[PDB]
Each structure stands twice: as structure tokens, then as C-alpha cells.
Amino acid sequence: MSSIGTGYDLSASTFSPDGRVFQVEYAMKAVENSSTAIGIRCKDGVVFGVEKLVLSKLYEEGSNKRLFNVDRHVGMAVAGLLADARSLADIAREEASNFRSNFGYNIPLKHLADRVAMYVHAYTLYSAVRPFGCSFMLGSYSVNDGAQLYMIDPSGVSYGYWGCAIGKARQAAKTEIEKLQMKEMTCRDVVKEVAKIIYIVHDEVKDKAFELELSWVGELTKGRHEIVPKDVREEAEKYAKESLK
Amino acid sequence: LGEGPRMVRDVFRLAKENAPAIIFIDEIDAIATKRFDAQTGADREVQRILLELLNQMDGF
Amino acid sequence: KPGDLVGVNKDSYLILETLPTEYDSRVKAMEVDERPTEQYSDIGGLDKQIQELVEAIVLPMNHKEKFENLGIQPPKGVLMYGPPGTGKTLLARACAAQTKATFLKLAGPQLVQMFIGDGAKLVRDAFALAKEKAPSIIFIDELDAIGTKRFDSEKAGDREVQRTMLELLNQLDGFQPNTQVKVIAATNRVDILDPALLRSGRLDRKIEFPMPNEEARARIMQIHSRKMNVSPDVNYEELARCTDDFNGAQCKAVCVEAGMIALRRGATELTHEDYMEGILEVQAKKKANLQYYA
């Protein structure tokens, strides 16, 4: 990049000789430093999985929320710095909340991903506010497209994914998703499998323990978005530990 | 070192004896610097070519 | 042949002798010094990374037959990046001693020199020095020092420094060998470099060291407790949970400093106050008051 003493990396309404702002790139490192969020598109729903690091042994699930329920059919799984994740969560919740209430049907995702990414990007343009140093995914079950999963980067670029991972081992996680067929597989089986990828990522010589938050929006819940039921949640983690060894 | 201004005088002189004659320098720059460092032997030598040149210009 | 030294007598120019081709005095400094072992177990945490460096650097040289069996080329170079104190240099040393591997100390500014054009010839001499030693590790500190090209400079900007970054590429293209010799490149900021110097397949492997986490803190603290006393009351691992994340150099530094208060008192034992005082010793002060920040 550059480390010029006036602007370019110290502002973000200033483009480099090539046309890029260094400030968004510094932010892009931030998703890499902490734990992964995986999310794969099914066709009966979407299954999300974020490993929440047990930093303190005096926490309970619902602490350092990486998993948000955006609406009652829309999820958001984030990776990277949690403060920029919260902002992104707040905007997403309001955008989803007006659409169910008013229209009366489930939100087609592809527009939603574009709007939120517009929000990210509008802030990048400005030098008065910051690029968002989070990468996040949105997932929904719709009656106009079925399941959709889109991943939006800290740059405000939106692409749809059959199966994504954003986090501290994208390369290892994406590849495991490639091998498996989860693209059009049933949500129930997927729960176990998403957890199992989280198990590979996690180390018992870089992490102590994590608490699994998965989120359903699929056939068990009848398309309702809830954070994983305690029985199911446990079952899926139980499989993850047992199958490696 | 030392030979660099000595060259200039003779070549420039050839023109004068067999006058009219044209001395044509392709690119006058790498010598026509308005700034010399003048602390290393290398800088000093360029400074000596320019010094000879000016003198010689009146000489023609 | 051209490049060879030969003696010639001043009193009348006859060839006194024939001498073989040889490097400058500066280059002699650049050759081996060797670094001692931190041992893989003993250098705390960063487990996934021990594998990445070991595989890339030491294995193609020492455990060469397995690579020949794989059929791959040796790496042209590796990069170590991330913010400091993550054990980038630290891991490399561990590897250097155990296997036995030539680690060429090189200081990045040393290539640049007062003598014009010659500074670059030093870069050639250094790469050359590795060819003969092959396989080699050329350990380079601070890549910013080799230079950065982006010049339109007509006002100053030296351009000894311009030559020296350009020269690395020259040596670095395939024409002049560099397949077998690895360059261990290290920089805290790759936020100041250009793509010509960096970028994959010129320095093939790119190794990350992200911020640590609790377990990684746990292993470092455990190695450290053996050497000097550490309080039951608080351990850096325990301390980290309340606070947030911190790098491995930071964890050892607070710890040495905690002992320092204790040594000063005249006790070999450590208290919780010595560690808390330690956090405060790292921060800056100019009004020293926590009763205004009460």
C-alpha cells in the first residue's frame, strides 16, 4: 500500500495512483485475525455456524454475539471485529423488519445484499467515516428464490455463494465444503457437517474451547429463524468431536 | 581523471583551424547540469567539462 | 577469465600471480553466525504456524529426498507477515539450530552503500554467496531498507536505493538461479511495499501469523514459570480473559517486568500487584492520577 505522511492511507476520500483506498485493505486483515463463520445455502433453508471463542470461563451463550437473527427468516453470520459487526447488524435488522411487516412475504436476498453492501461502500467513499472491517454473510429462505446466501466483504462487494466461510482459515473450510454436497442437501444433515468444519478450524493448541451457535432456518423450525435448539446444538457438536478421531 | 577537459579543447580546436566547421553535440545534458555536487571525484570531473566548455565557446 | 583477480607488479607490469575471485569485506559480515534453538515445543503457541515455517524453510534443504519424491521445485522465497511479537523471527531461529541450516544474517540497510553503483554489486555478492552455499536461507531484516521504487524524483531521492531493490529482482528472475535458495523475508508492514518485490511465485509461500488466543498464551506462560516465579493469584493467561488479546512478546515482557518490581523489593516471590503495576509500566504517563480517572 503506501504509508504516506498526508492522506491516501490516512484518508479514504482519496484514491491511490492506481485507484484504490488503502484504508479498506487494512480493515480486510481484521476478518482473518479472529474465528470463522461458515454458512452454506441449502434449498429448504440455510444453515449457519459461528464458533464463539471461550475467552473467559465465566461467560454464558449470548455473549460476544456473532450470530444475529436479522428477522424471522433472515440470519447474519459475521466474522472479524465485532464492533463493526454490530453496526451492520442494526441496519440489516431495520431493512428486513420493514419488508416483512409491509409486504407480507419473505425477502428475496439478492437485493438485500446489494443494499447493505451499498451502506458499507458509501462509508468507504467518505473520509469523515471509516470502512467497515468486518466481513459478514446474509442468509434467507424465500418463496421467490428459495434459499440464498450472499457474502459481503469489508469492501462492499456482494457475491452469492452455494457455501462460504470467512474467517481465520478460509482455505481449509472452503475446500471441505467443496468435497461435500450441501449445495442442495437437506438442512438436518447439514447442521452436523457445518459444526464438523468448525472442529477442523479450531485447535486445542490455539484455542481452549468454543461454544457452538448454529442457527436454523429450515425444515425443523418450519422456516422460522431461531438460534439452534439446545438439544440439536449439542448433537451437532457431539458429532464434530467424535468423527475427527 | 584530468583528461576529460583536455579532450574538449582539441576537438573544438579542429573546427577552428579548418574554419567554417560545425561542432554538433547530440544531447548536451549529463554535462550541462546547473547543479554539481562537487565533493566526490566523479562530480568534480563533470564540473570540469562544463567549465572548459564555456571558455571554449568564446574561443571559436 | 573476466572477474578474476590477478596480481601485477608496480615496478614493471608483469603478472605477479593468479588469485581466485572473492567477495568484499562487508559481505564477510553477511556470512554465517548461527542462532541457537528455541525448540518447537518450548516456543509457546502458534501451533498451525510451526508447521507452516518448518515445511517451507528447513524441510526442502534437510529432508530434501521427500521433496524430490513429491516432484515440486524448492521455494524461491517465503514471507513472514503480521504485527510484531507474534514469533516470526523467533520460530525461524528454532529451526536454524535444530536441523542445521545456514542462516545468513543480513541487515537490510547494509546493501545500500556510500559508493555509487557498488551497493548493488553487494546484493549480487550476497545472492552469490548463497548459490555456492546452496541450499541457503538468506535472512533479511526490514525489506523497506532494500528500497521502494515508485520514483519520478528529479529532486534528490538518491537512487542507490532505487538500484538495490531492482537488483534483487534481477537476481530473483530464473535466468540467474534462485530456485534452490530460499530467502526468508520478514516485514511488520507490507503496507509500504510494492507488488514487484513481494507477490506470490517470486517469494512463493506467504506465511501469516495472526494475533494469539488463550491457549497460545497458556503455553508461553507455562515455559516462563519454570525459569522465574509467577504468582498463583494471576497468570497472563488468566489476565487476558478479563482484558482482550495481546501478542506473545507482550505476554513475556509484562512477566519479566513483574519480576523486576519483585527483584527490586528483594523477593523472589511475585504478587498480583507486581503484575498490575506491570500493565501501568507499559502505558505512558504525564499526570499520574487514577483518582481523576476514578
Add this chain to the structure above:
Amino acid sequence: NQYDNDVTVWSPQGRIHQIEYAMEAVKQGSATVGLKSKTHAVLVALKRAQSELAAHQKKILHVDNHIGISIAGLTADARLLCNFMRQECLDSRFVFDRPLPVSRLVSLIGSKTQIPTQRYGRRPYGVGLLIAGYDDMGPHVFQTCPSANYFDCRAMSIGARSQSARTYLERHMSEFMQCNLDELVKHGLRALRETLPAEQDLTTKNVSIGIVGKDLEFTIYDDDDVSPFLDGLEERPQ
């Protein structure tokens, strides 16, 4: 360096240095233990005075008679967050006519904290609050930091010399939950005394307690009933 020159400028650390400066303000601040049961949520705070010929004053500030806060950092900055919190409780009462859901309540604060972090070079609020609230879900003790991220903790201790207080929370992690309300305040003063050296020990003057819950409004005891709780020592051996 030049990546903490503003909070807009991102660090190649993955977290801006300025976010992390704000975390030191809270550490430099008052030792505070926050624990909950399954009816009540208790805030134990350590008072401090700025003069010798002054009687120490509460570091528990009221949000209201149903949600309340304990400051660790600046008194002014805690109060600045407080005023917004007070308003929410005033609206909760209008709309719901219940004590505002604690988790909801914390996310709206987090939204506010998020804003200077977005702005050019502006200050993230350098208080951490341990928030004790009682809703229909149960008691909640939350940890709020100088970032927008909140933790839902079983028991957490933040401020100065708080690790010694933190090992106490770990030891009696299950115990708080089952216990009666008087005991909940008792473990908090035992934990809070652990921050201090063996020499320095809690007395009625420097002890502030905030109790909120099912059965009762937020009450501050500064010498109101601090004493029966204060009873029995158990400090960390330094």
C-alpha cells in the same frame, strides 16, 4: 504510529489501537464486581474520593429503579451513557409498562458507542459498565466495553486489580445462581476485597452496593445496610 492518528484509519493489527487505548481508561478506573442470581442482580462497587477531608461517594449511578449501572473509567462518561439509559427506562414504562428487556437495553447503548468509532478521530467512550437489570427472562449482569460488543456474563469483574476478584467468581461460579439475595451481596464484597492487598480491606465508608431484582427497586446502600454484608473476611493471599 500513524494508524491510531484517528479512529477512521484502520490498523494492520485487525483492531484499531485507539479502540484498545479506551480499554486502559476502564482498567485505570474502579474495581467492580457484578454477579447475578436467578432473581436478583447485584452490583458491588468500590468508592474513591479526590480528597482526604471528604467522605467517599457512590460509583453506582442510577439509571433507574429497575435497570442500574456501575462505572469503571470516567464518571462523566458513565453519566453521559446513563442519561440515554434513563430516557429508555422512561419510554419503556410508557410503551411496555414492564422493566425494559436487559439484552435489548444493552444493544441500544452499543449503537451509541459505535457512532464516535465511525467518526473522524472522535473518542470512543472509555467506560465499561456492569449493568444489572431485571426483566421477564431473569436477572442479567452484562459487560459493556469501550467497543460496541457486549458480553452476557455469569459474573464478571472489571477495573483495577480485578483478576484476583475474577478467580473468586470462577471458584463460586455455580453458587451465585442458587443463592439467597443477602449472600449474593456477600460474595461480591469478598471478591472486591480480593483486588486490594492483604493490608487494605473494605469498610462501610468505601462500599457501595446496588441491588435490583424481582422483588425490589434499585437501592443504593452507602451506609444504609452495608454493614451486615461487609461481615467476614476472605482475601486473596498476595
Add this chain to the structure above:
Amino acid sequence: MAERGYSFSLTTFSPSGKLVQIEYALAAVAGGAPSVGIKAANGVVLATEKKQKSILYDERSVHKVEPITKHIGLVYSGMGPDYRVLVHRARKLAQQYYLVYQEPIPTAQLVQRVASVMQEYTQSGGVRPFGVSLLICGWNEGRPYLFQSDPSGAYFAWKATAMGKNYVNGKTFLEKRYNEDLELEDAIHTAILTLKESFEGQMTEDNIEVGICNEAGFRRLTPTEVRDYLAAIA
């Protein structure tokens, strides 16, 4: 917008007695393609040459001559992006004046109104001073009008003026050939001569545009007519 924004001026005076950015802007108008505007005193003709240089422009619409309304037209100089806002702006103004007067905006009046907005853009922050020069033509109230609006905000009423590439030469030819209160034929002829002074933007009919204002309103001329006027000049 969703940010703090700017409000500081990007221009500061000089102990010279100049504003720095408007002088850089003046260089950009000169770097344009020749645009001339003459008030004959029997109609107003605005002529320009447009560097397309490929004639892969299917414009039957937008051009460098664009009508603002039915008896106002506009021709620019310099760069296109700055033009785009000014042309839209002018149309809006044309609409504001249309509602009350219902005779579209008069030229003397237009300039004052554009000039005030241009001055703010220098004076304020989060905006910048143009580097376009507009030539405004109109025939309204039984008089032709020609004004030139500078990238600072300044307005001068001219009989004949030039801008774009090699304006210095243009203004000097304009004084010699054109004298005040000569015919519609002279105004048109010198107008096309200034473009020919130095061309170099592909010599095809669709690479010059003229739009003429007269007693019956404003229309832009077909490229084929424009070429006939050129053909005379060698």
C-alpha cells in the same frame, strides 16, 4: 449525508491578489475544443467543434450544443463532466422562471442566477469551483443576448468572444473581422473560421455542431449544414 462532511473552503487568497484554483481552472477551459459565441444583432449563433474522433457517437440527443429551453441554448468549453451538472441546472432554472413568467428565462437574468451558485461552490467546502466556461445565447424581448460565464462565477456581456483551444488567436481574429453591429452572415462565417483556426478532432460532419437562436426560438443545426459553412474556409 451519513458522515460529518466538509465546509472548509479549498481557496485561500494570495498576497498576489488572486484566487489559486480558479487560475488552474482557466487552463482547463483553454484545453477544450473551440467554442465561439457571437451576438450578431440579427440573432445569436453558438458554434462548437466536438472531439469525438471516431464518429461512433449515435447522438441525436445530447451534444456539446444542448437546448436549455426553446429560446435558450448552451455551449461549453473544457471538460464534459462539469458540463453535465450545468446543463441540468440551467434546465431547472428555465423551469422555475417558466412557471411565473411563462416566457422561458432571459439571458441577462440567467447569468446572475448561475453566478451566484458558482460563487458558493468556491466559497464553501465539500464542493469545488468549476473549470468550464459557458456561452449563453438567447433571443427574448426582441433583442439577442450573448454572455460568457467564467468558471469563477463572473459574467461579462460580449459581442463576440472565444474560448477553447487557441482562444488568444480567436479573440484577436474576432476583433479584426468582426466589428460591432455587422450582419448575421458575418457572425456565422467568422464563427466557423475560429473552429477552423485549429481543428484536429476528425473531419466528418458529425464532429461540429452549431445551434442558432433567432426571432422564432432556438434549434440546433443538423451536422450536414454545419459542414457547408466550414467548406468555404480553406
Add this chain to the structure above:
Amino acid sequence: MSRGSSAGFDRHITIFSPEGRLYQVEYAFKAINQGGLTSVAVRGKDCAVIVTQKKVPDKLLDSSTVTHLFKITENIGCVMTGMTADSRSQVQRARYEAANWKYKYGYEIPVDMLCKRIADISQVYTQNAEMRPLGCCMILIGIDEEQGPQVYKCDPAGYYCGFKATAAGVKQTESTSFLEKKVKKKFDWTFEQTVETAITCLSTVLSIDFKPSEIEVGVVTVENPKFRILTEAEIDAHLVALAERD
């Protein structure tokens, strides 16, 4: 030097510079090349066709979701070329502008008018120092309600003009040159021929030849005003057609 020299604060934000344009504005043109997309635009007389490279950087993408072709209205379709971060953001801004006309007017907006409202929009970004100009350009196709099929393109600095043929990309000057010779030699334009000119020109300069899942073709035909995605089967059809021309 040049393209990185202070003279005001014009290498930082928009204000004119010694170069007779604006430095900040020029990075916004330079920015188009970075994205890696190149587009060829041909205007037919039965359709208006844009073909642009579709950036595929994973193998875990669904085809439908990942595109740069967007429906602005049921009359206008577009491709975004340049930086993808800037692409999503401009499209959402355009959409509000298209919709704003849509209620008032009671009919489909002209391609010329859509380009005029967006072009002006890209100018606000450019005029402002509050935000930097767009790193992308939107190139419009549509059936104009009497003029015919029309191709207009608005700049990343926001100026728009009509075109027989347009190109923007990594190589803006060279594609345009290849494209004028195809127009000169006039094979005429049907649905298939005009699409064919457009793809070949994008293939010849860069020297690739594509898979149908790494080019995208988008049309607005006079079959119906609505914008369509042709999808891979029909895109493949056009690729094979290119052989043994002209």
C-alpha cells in the same frame, strides 16, 4: 512530478490541478482497469447489446446470483465495469432515480433520461470532496420509445453521450479501435450479428475466447420491453457463431 503532486489539495479531493483536469478524477478513470472487466457495446437496430466479462473468482458460486447485469427498470438493463465495490453502490442509487420517474411519469423512462439522471448523480460525487468519485461506469441498453434501440454510457466522473459502439475496460482505447473497423465493414445487424460483433471484439484484443459462464450477454430486444438474462445455453450459441467470419 505528475499524478501525485500537491498544488492545492487536488491530489486528495476534487479541485482542479496543473494537469487541466483533476487528479482525484483521473484515479477514478484508472480505477476501471483494476476491476479487470472489459466491455464492448454495439447498437443494433433490433436490439441493443452489451457483453462484458463476468468476474468469477470462486467455484462455490451460483451462476444466477453472481453477475454484473442489473435490472434498473422494465425497459433498461445495464452492465457494471470497474471496481465491484463501487458497482453495487451505484446501481442502488440509479434504482431510486428510475423509480422516482416511474410513479410521476406513468410510463417507462427513456434510455437517454435514465442516463441523464444517473450521469448527474456521478457528477455530484465528482463535484464533492465529501466523497470520492465512482470507480465504475454503467453502460445502458434499452428500446427508446421512438428513436429505436439506444446505447448510452455515463462516465465514472459522470458525463454521458450516445454511441453506435462503445468500449470501456482495461484497454479502453484499443477496444474502441477494433470496434470502428467492425462498424466500417458493415455486415448489418440482426439479433445474432450484432451480438456476434460485440463478443468477438472483446475476445480479440485481450486474446482469450470464453466459456459461456465467464462472459455475460444482456439484451433488450423489441420482443418485449423487459430486460432478460439469456443464460449460458444461449450465450454458448453466440460463441460458436463467431467462427468462420466475416
Add this chain to the structure above:
Amino acid sequence: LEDYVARPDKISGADINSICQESGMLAVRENRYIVLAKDFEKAYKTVIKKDEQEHEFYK
């Protein structure tokens, strides 16, 4: 002679010589002594660049 010079802006004489030199080169690639209309025109646009691009650089 009229067509080729007219289309761009003016350039240095060495620039005129080099594009012409390129025309001569494209003719050799095909293997022809006669340089075509296509060769002469294709070469002319290249090297110098920016001789048709005004489509985002409109003046």
C-alpha cells in the same frame, strides 16, 4: 494523406515516424511488401494511443 493526419490530435514528429514504422512491420507479419489500408490504420492508432478515446474523456 488527408484522412490519417486529421483524425487524432497533433503529435511529435518522432511519434508520426514510429506508427508509420509499425504499419511497415504489420505488413511483414502477414508477409506482404504492400502494406494494406487495415495495416496502416491499425498501426496508426497504436503505440501513441488515445486517438479514438474521448468516450469518457469527452472534451
Add this chain to the structure above:
Amino acid sequence: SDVGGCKEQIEKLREVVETPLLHPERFVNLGIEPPKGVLLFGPPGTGKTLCARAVANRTDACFIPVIGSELVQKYVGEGARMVRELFEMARTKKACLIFFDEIDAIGGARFDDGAGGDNEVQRTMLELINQLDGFDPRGNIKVLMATNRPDTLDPALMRPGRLDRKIEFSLPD
């Protein structure tokens, strides 16, 4: 007497500075790694040099203070030779204290813009930074750096083991 004698500022500086030079014996015994770097910072006249002189005398280690502005001389690379040789020489020497006085002259910002360039300054600065701990473990010979800006420092200098604790002597307490 002008110092203010024992200040809070002086005492913090002694723990790091005095104590290994005076006795490495106590360090090995407890088993603590020996410190390296103290970074003294504040605008002119907050006494970075005054305190450093006071601790120097107390420890009674041989004292070489030097201005970086003379380790910059002639062209690029000659100044760099001076810094490495000096530093090494001190390192060899048992119980050496080096107080590097005012470095924005081997301590400035790192960039170029290609209309200037900080290079000559950066060659030397980087040469200092490299040498302090080294690519070797560390010695027990102390380095102190006095800087005129905390705004010019690159992360290599800041790593613990070339800078274990940052002490701010800015606007005395």
C-alpha cells in the same frame, strides 16, 4: 538539584536501566530475561536527556551519548556504516549504557513520494533498529532511544525485546 532529584519518572527509569548493568547475577538467579529498550518521548524540554544522564552516573557504567545528526554525513550509506560499527563496538564492551540523544535525524518517518524521499534518514534509522536486540537472543548491554515525535516510529522499533515498556517523560507529572 535541577532534575527535581528523585521523581516518579526517575525511579521507573532505574528498574530497567541501572539494574542489569550493575548486577547481571541477580537476573540469572531469579531467572528473568534481561530487558532491552526504553523509549523516551515528549516534545522538547521535558527532559528525556536530563533523566538519562542522572541514571547513567548512578549505575556508573561507561557512558557514550551521541547525536544521530553526526551519524548522518556525506551521502547515503556512509552514515549507515558509522551506526553499525559504533553499535557493535559498544555491544562487545561489558556494562555499556548508550543514550541515543534526539533522533529525528535517524528516527524520522518512512516514506517516499518520488518528489523527495526520506531514504538517507531511513537507511540509518533502520540500521539502528536492527542492531538493538539483533537477530541474536539479546545481550545485557542497554539501549535508550530519545525521540522527538511518537508519530514517526515504525512497528519494528516498537516490538518488546527491542522496546519492553514505553515510558512517557512528556509534560512531567
Add this chain to the structure above:
Amino acid sequence: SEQIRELREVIELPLTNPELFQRVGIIPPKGCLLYGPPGTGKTLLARAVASQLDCNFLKVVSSSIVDKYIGESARLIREMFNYARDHQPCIIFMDEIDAIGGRRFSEGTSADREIQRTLMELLNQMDGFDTLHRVKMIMATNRPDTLDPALLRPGRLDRKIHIDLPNEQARLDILKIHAGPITKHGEIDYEAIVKLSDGFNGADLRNVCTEAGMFAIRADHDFVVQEDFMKAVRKVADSKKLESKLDYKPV
């Protein structure tokens, strides 16, 4: 392959005979400028065409041309050509022409002082009064924007060849050769690499194979496996993009 042809006209054809160009009417171009986004193959292109032809080849370090001693730097440039003229037909390759390239200067240092002089001599031999009968000069440049304005302007650097970063067809064929020396496990993975590949350069093409060997050893295989090629393509793309942004399409 198309981009290689354009280069070929200047380099190969006048060597056998200058007659071919003579036939058309015009002198053959002098000095090929290879430019291309970072890592494409610009330096490689020069080397490769030479290796194939088997004509005498000077490969020259450009930071070895300049030295302290004055006019010593003047002597090397005329000399590289003069040797090359003696041993015709010939190719002269200078890599990274930026080193010799100077600016207009005269606020310079001693280092700059030398650079303008080498710069000056090259003009006079290359296109000046003196000419090159069959010596062709190949220049390799990462970014040409350091060179003197006289040099930049065509009619010195007559040919302005742009070499575009690997094609969608190119990446498939390139990948295969680099894979061949390697021991397989029944790899099909090539098609997956191109789809995954983004921002890829020639250097990048080589690297995905290079990295896969390292990962195999972790897997516990003495030959490359299927898992390691997928890991490699994603890992190289993320790292490039994140650390810095390439210059697409140099001057």
C-alpha cells in the same frame, strides 16, 4: 501466444535477413519495450525468444552498468552494443531498464549524476546517427514511469508492447506443464484452479504447484494430492489482494 508474435517480428526476422523489412520500404523497429501488469512474464518473454533462436545473447544487469568512477558508466552502454555488433546476428537484453533511466535532474545526488549519462549514451547508439543492423534490444519493465521523457516518447522505445496477464485459455495450458515434473495422486484439479484463480499472473501460475508440495507433507503423502491443489489456489488469491493492489496495464 499472440503477444509473443508482435515481439517476434522485431527480434527474429531481421537476424536471418534485414531484406524482409527492406522489401516493404522501411527500416526495422529498434528497442522492444515489454510492459505488462506485475508478475506477467515481461522479463521471461525476452529470455525465451532468445533461448529458442540460439543467437548470441547478452543478459545484462543494469545496476552493474553504473559505478562510482565517471564515464566508466558512459563506456559500458556503448560497449554492450559494440560487442553485440561484432558478434552479429545478436540480441542484447537489459532487464529492469529503470536503473539506467534517469530523469531530467540537476537537483540530484552523485547517484543521479551517473544515471543521466548512461541514459544519454543509449539514445545516440540506439536510434541516433549510429544504427543497429541486426542487434535488437529488449527492455523489461515492471512499470515504466521512472525513465527519462525522451526515452518514454516513441521513436526511441518505438514498440510499446503490452503483455496482458494470463488468459482464461492460457492459465489452463500453463498450469499443465508446471504440474508435469510433479508426481500425481490422480489429479484432475486443473479446471478448479482456473475458476478459483483471480488476479493470477504468470508467477502465480507457478506458485499453486509450488505450495501444494508443502501441504502434501502435512497430509502424510510423498506425492501431491487433490486437497493441497484446492487449498493452494484460494490461499495465493487472498494473500495477494489483501497485502497490496497490482498496477493493471502499465504505460
Add this chain to the structure above:
Amino acid sequence: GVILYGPPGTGKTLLAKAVANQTSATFLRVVGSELIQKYLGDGPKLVRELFRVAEEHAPSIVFIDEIDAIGTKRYDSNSGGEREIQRTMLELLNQLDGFDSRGDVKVIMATNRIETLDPALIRPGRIDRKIEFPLPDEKTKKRIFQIHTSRMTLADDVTLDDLIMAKDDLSGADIKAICTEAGLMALRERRMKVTNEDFKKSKENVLYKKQEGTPEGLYL
């Protein structure tokens, strides 16, 4: 030392030279702008020499004229660059006190203002006392003029009072300028006389150049 700032022209330069004779200190004069120069690394070396020589001479005062110059300008005309300015600025500080702590070397600093001066250089406690001159009044002005009248050709056509009165509350320099321009003016005429006519013409030019009263008269 002392720091001489306020309205420029009071007679800041005369004062160092005059006090220097009374004390009988060796008077070294060196401009602050002369220390930054083309040569690379010569810049701090020169500053060392300046101090070293002052010390050897023994009683000394170093009058540093126009030191304001290093700060005001980032010259962009030196090959030494921004690097040069940095390294020079530190060395003077080092040589002054520093760890060097040289004695008998007073520095009297002439500046325009010390609000335009570089913040590194300026700092209290190297220079114990700072003096701010007031605007010179009508009263102070008469005494300076009587001296210049004594040095000048003597006549009754010298009219001191009129010139002093007309002018506002403004510098000592002007009194010097009126006398020097008046002699010059005489030569133009082909006269070796300096009369009331040369003075009246001189009053106009001196007054405009220095600050000029007709802007100020509105604001008052």
C-alpha cells in the same frame, strides 16, 4: 540569552551590536537560513563549528539573525531536502546546552515573531527571558532622530518633528529609512544637499512600504 520579538523594525539588530560593545564580547553573526544548503551532511557540522568557535573565543554572544527562516520555509530547493532541515534543527539544541552544556555562550535570537518560529527550537528554560517591544510611540522617536540629524548635513531645513508627527505608532526602522532615502534622493537632483523637500518625498515611500496608514484609518 534573550528572544527579541514583537513589531519588526524596532531596532532589534542595533541592540545586539550595541550591547555587544559595552560587554566587550566577541560578536559572531550567522544567518539561520545559511545553515541549510545544497551540500549533504555539511548542515549540522557547520552548526557544531558555530558553537565550538564561540566557546573558544571566550566571552561570547552569538547573534543569530533571521533564525525565523528555518521554520517559515520548507525550501524545496535543496538537494538535502526535508532531511536536511530536520537534522540541522536538532544539532543547534545539542550544541546549546544538550548533554554538552556549554557555558559562556549567550544566544540572542532575532526573529520576526516567535509565533512563526519552529516549536522544536523555541522552549523556555534555554532562554530565561523573552522581551516583547511595544509599538514605538511619537515620544521615543524624537531622540533617535536628533542623533541621525547630528550624523546628517546640518541645516534649519532639516524638519524632524513634522515627519514623526504625521506618522503613526510604528517602528524605529522608519527613522533610519527617512534619513537614508533622503540622501539618495538628493543625488537624483544633482544636489549634495538634503533639505525639507527630500524628506517630504521620503515620508511617502517609507510609510507605504512598512505598513501603510490608509488601510488602517478605516478600522480605527
